């Protein structure tokens, strides 16, 4: 199957998923000088007060916290979005070293990791149908740099030993994703894609300018996860990021400056 290795990583994905070479692939480098300040963009409304986390799993690519998105709870709106997008899950991408790991880059700078909070447009009824639409998903991306710990991340870090290998899952209730957000909601936005197969061009990307800081111990715990299932040769889950893709005919818009 697809993965992040020499023989099945990003440079191979186009063979099963030809949209890999499409016109709106993600991630991209955000060239801050070239991004257009758009005074008509709205502040982003992030309304996470009633979020209900359910489960955390290791899917062999990342780990993901899934939410109960069966009611209009945790929702994203405003910004570049028309309508209401409901939070369904978050997951991360990270590196083998603190100098790489993010998917998006800023002026070619790579962060240690990137958090993706995945939301689907309610007009499409469910996440699966939304992923078939050009405005189906909105992913809020947040960079992680290594420095002081993020207290709101610790609950996640501490359960990872229970989901070490592909296929493992656990109950994971009462997790508040507000504890993963930076102070500022200033952002860049552009039309793009899923960053893993099937690479659907269904995402409005909203990438926050302000990174969150996590400690070296917290990110070390991410790197202790495994790509492999229990019983198979151990391959640490690190460098699960797709590199920047061609911007092609897109403009990245800034909510600030």
Ligand X SMILES: NS(=O)(=O)c1c(F)c(F)c(S(=O)(=O)CCO)c(F)c1F
Q: Please report whether residue 237 would count as binding ligand X according to CB under 6 A.
A: no
The yes or no reply on residue 131 touching ligand X (CB under 6 A) is yes
Q: Please, what is the minimum distance in Å from the beta carbon of residue 91 to Zn ion?
A: 6
The C-alpha atoms of residue 199 and residue 216 are separated, in whole angstroms, by 31
Among ligand X, Zn ion, none, partner that 118 touches (CB below 5 to 8 angstroms by kind): ligand X
The sign of the CA dihedral 18, 21, 25, 27 is: positive
In this complex, which beta carbon is closest to ligand X, that of residue 128 or of residue 151? 128
Please check if 93 is assigned to a binding site.
Answer: yes
Q: Indicate which residues carry an active-site annotation.
A: 61
Residue 131 binding result from Zn ion, ligand X, none, given CB thresholds of 5 to 8 Å by partner type: ligand X
- Rounded CA gap, 160 and 156, in Å? 7
Provide, rounded to whole angstroms, the least separation between the CB of residue 113 and Zn ion: 11
- Nearest-CA neighbor of 122 among 90, 83, 89, 88? 83
Number of residues this chain uses to bind Zn ion (CB under 5 A): 1
Q: Binding marks (x or -) toward ligand X, 190..229, rule CB under 6 A?
A: ----xxx------x--------------------------
Please choose, out of 115-123, 167-175, 205-213, 221-229, the segment that lies near Zn ion by the rule CB under 5 A: 115-123
Please check if 91 is assigned to a binding site: yes
Burial class of 125 by CB neighbour count within 10 A (0 to 12, 13 to 18, 19+): exposed
For ligand X, the closer CB: 185 or 194: 194
Residue 12 marked as a ligand binder: no
Among 116, 150, 209, 221, binds Zn ion (CB under 5 A): 116
Q: Which of 24, 110, 116, 168 binds ligand X (CB under 6 A)?
A: 116
Closer CB to ligand X, 141 or 211, in the complex: 141
CA angle at 101 for the pair 174 and 37, rounded to the nearest 5°: 85
Q: Could you tell me the smallest distance in angstroms from the CB atom of residue 39 to ligand X?
A: 28
Give the footprint of ligand X on this chain (CB under 6 A): 116, 118, 131, 139, 194-196, 203
Binding positions: 91, 93, 116, 195-196
Judged by the rule CB under 5 A, the positions of this chain that interact with Zn ion are 116
């Amino acid at each position: 199957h697809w993965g992040y290795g020499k023989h099945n990583g990003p440079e191979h994905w186009h063979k099963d998923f030809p949209i890999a070479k499409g016109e709106r692939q993600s991630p991209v480098d955000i060239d801050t000088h070239t991004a257009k300040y758009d005074p008509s963009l709205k502040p982003l409304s992030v309304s996470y007060d009633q979020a209900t986390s359910l489960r955390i799993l290791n899917n062999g690519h990342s780990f993901k916290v899934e939410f109960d998105d069966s009611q209009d709870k945790a929702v994203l709106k405003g910004g570049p979005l028309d309508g209401t997008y409901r939070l369904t899950q978050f997951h991360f991408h990270w590196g083998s070293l603190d100098g790489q790991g993010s998917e998006h880059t800023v002026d070619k700078k790579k962060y240690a990791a990137e958090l993706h909070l995945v939301h689907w447009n309610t007009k499409y009824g469910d996440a699966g149908k939304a992923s078939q639409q050009p405005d189906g998903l909105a992913v809020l991306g947040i960079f992680l740099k290594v420095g002081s710990a993020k207290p709101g991340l610790q609950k996640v870090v501490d359960v990872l030993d229970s989901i070490k290998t592909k296929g493992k899952s656990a109950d994971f209730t009462n997790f508040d994703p507000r504890g993963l957000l930076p102070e500022s909601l200033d952002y860049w936005t552009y039309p793009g894609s899923l960053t893993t197969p099937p690479l659907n061009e269904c995402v409005t990307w909203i990438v926050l300018k302000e990174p969150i800081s996590v400690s070296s111990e917290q990110v070390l715990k991410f790197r202790k996860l495994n790509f492999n299932g229990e019983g198979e040769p151990e391959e640490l889950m690190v460098d699960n990021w797709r590199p920047a893709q061609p911007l092609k005919n897109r403009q990245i818009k800034a909510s600030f400056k």
